[PDB]
Amino acid sequence: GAEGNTLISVDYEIFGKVQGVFFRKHTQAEGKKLGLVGWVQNTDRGTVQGKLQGPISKVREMQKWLETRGSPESHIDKANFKNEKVILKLDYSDFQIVK
């Protein structure tokens, strides 16, 4: 088999018209495909503070799923990251949406 168990945690605030729509429902779904955790929630500025907790092996792909991809409703004109964090264990066990 192959080795590469690097668990990290990076949070960012995606831009674009991702506020006032129904994308979170799918944002948590896609996270199950790979097996990542975290949380999703909009702000009162015009962005969405989303975090990608899990193995880099998957995060490397999830970073594009939210940066380039997203949903048919909302839109993403631009996006960026803040600063990842190398951890030994994920604070969360499963992906969930914030009310």
Helix proportion range: 10-25%
The tally of strands reads 4
What composes the largest sheet? 2 strands, antiparallel
Helix/sheet category: alpha+beta
CATH architecture: 2-Layer Sandwich
How many discrete domains? Answer: 1
Q: Percent of residues in beta strands?
A: 15-25%
* Cα-atom radius of gyration: 13 Å
PDB class: hydrolase
Keywords: protein, Acetylation, Hydrolase
Assembly: monomeric
Entry title: Human Acylphosphatase(AcPh) surface charge-optimized
Architecture blueprint of SSEs:
Elements: E1 7-14, H1 24-34, E2 39-40, E3 48-55, H2 56-67, E4 96-97
Parallel strand pairs: 2-4
Antiparallel strand pairs: 1-3
Helix pairs in contact: 1-2
Produce a short descriptive summary:
The protein has 99 residues and is an alpha+beta fold. The chain has helices at residues 24-34, 56-67; strands at 7-14, 39-40, 48-55, 96-97.
Descriptive notes:
This protein is α+β, with helices and mostly antiparallel strands. It has a single domain (1-99), classed as 2-Layer Sandwich (Alpha-Beta Plaits). The chain has helices at 24-34, 56-67, and strands at 7-14, 39-40, 48-55, 96-97. The longest helix has 12 residues, at 56-67. It holds the Pfam family Acylphosphatase.
Question: Which structural traits does this protein have?
Answer:
Alpha-Beta Plaits, monomer, two-stranded parallel ribbon, 2 helices, 99 residues
